[PDB]
Design a protein around this ligand. Sequence first.
Ligand SMILES: NCCCNC(=O)c1ccc(-c2cccc3sc(C(=O)O)cc23)s1
Lengths: 270, 8
Amino acid sequence: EPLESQYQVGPLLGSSVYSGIRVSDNLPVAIKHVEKDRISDWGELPNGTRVPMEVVLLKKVSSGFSGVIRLLDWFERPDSFVLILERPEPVQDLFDFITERGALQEELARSFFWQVLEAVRHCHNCGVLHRDIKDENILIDLNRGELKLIDFGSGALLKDTVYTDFDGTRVYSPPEWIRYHRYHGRSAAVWSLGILLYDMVCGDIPFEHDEEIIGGQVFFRQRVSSECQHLIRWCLALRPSDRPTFEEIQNHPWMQDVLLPQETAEIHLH
Amino acid sequence: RKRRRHPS
Ligand SMILES: NCCCNC(=O)c1ccc(-c2cccc3sc(C(=O)O)cc23)s1
């Protein structure tokens, strides 16, 4: 069944991802093109079919929990792969949302961060490590108030052993990566979630340079509650083993009394 | 103090 018949292709979105529509029911989709010559990590499916790791990772997390953008279909071509993904509309990415709104109210940030935590727990439970958690890789469904993770292209199978490669965003990467070119998955994820939470409540990331990342100093440029400052500093512990678990984050006093997604939409997005 | 996207 050809790709060119099953889907109607619209204009670009970024990069190489196009707006599109599935003919069999006019579903909004996103159509992502990846050049074979640019892929580093290759997985195998049950079929044995050699595919990009991104396809392997997306299939493991696309089980129906809505906190991740689901892969609906994919196709191989001579020099490229084509991924069919879901497209919420209306949608805005968290980077653009924070750029326009500035620093978020703790209540909104609490809802957003909670949903990211549930989505990352989902990936971990499915054996997938994202490795590029940042505002740019989070979509907001503005009507539903639901956050969705995108871009598993820097991703990996979750292991308990050390990682020595990283193609994610340097300013969200942990001090142990900067210093020693080594990290563990969970502990690095919690560091990047510390950067993301700072980003939400202060209106930008805390660190631009290697020195700041390894420095172990977090200055708040914005009024932030003591409980929120405490959680951020805990996620941004220099020693990986000093960082909280996903459990400890979600049991943290700052994380209590979270809004439902619809409540979040009604109060803050509509 | 320019807020900007960062490549991966
Ligand atoms: N190949 C290297 C390029 C890496 N880029 C990616 O992985 C993606 C870019 C954005 C993706 C996306 C996915 C699904 C829906 C929507 S809507 C939307 C928007 O910005 O509005 C974007 C998306 S996925």
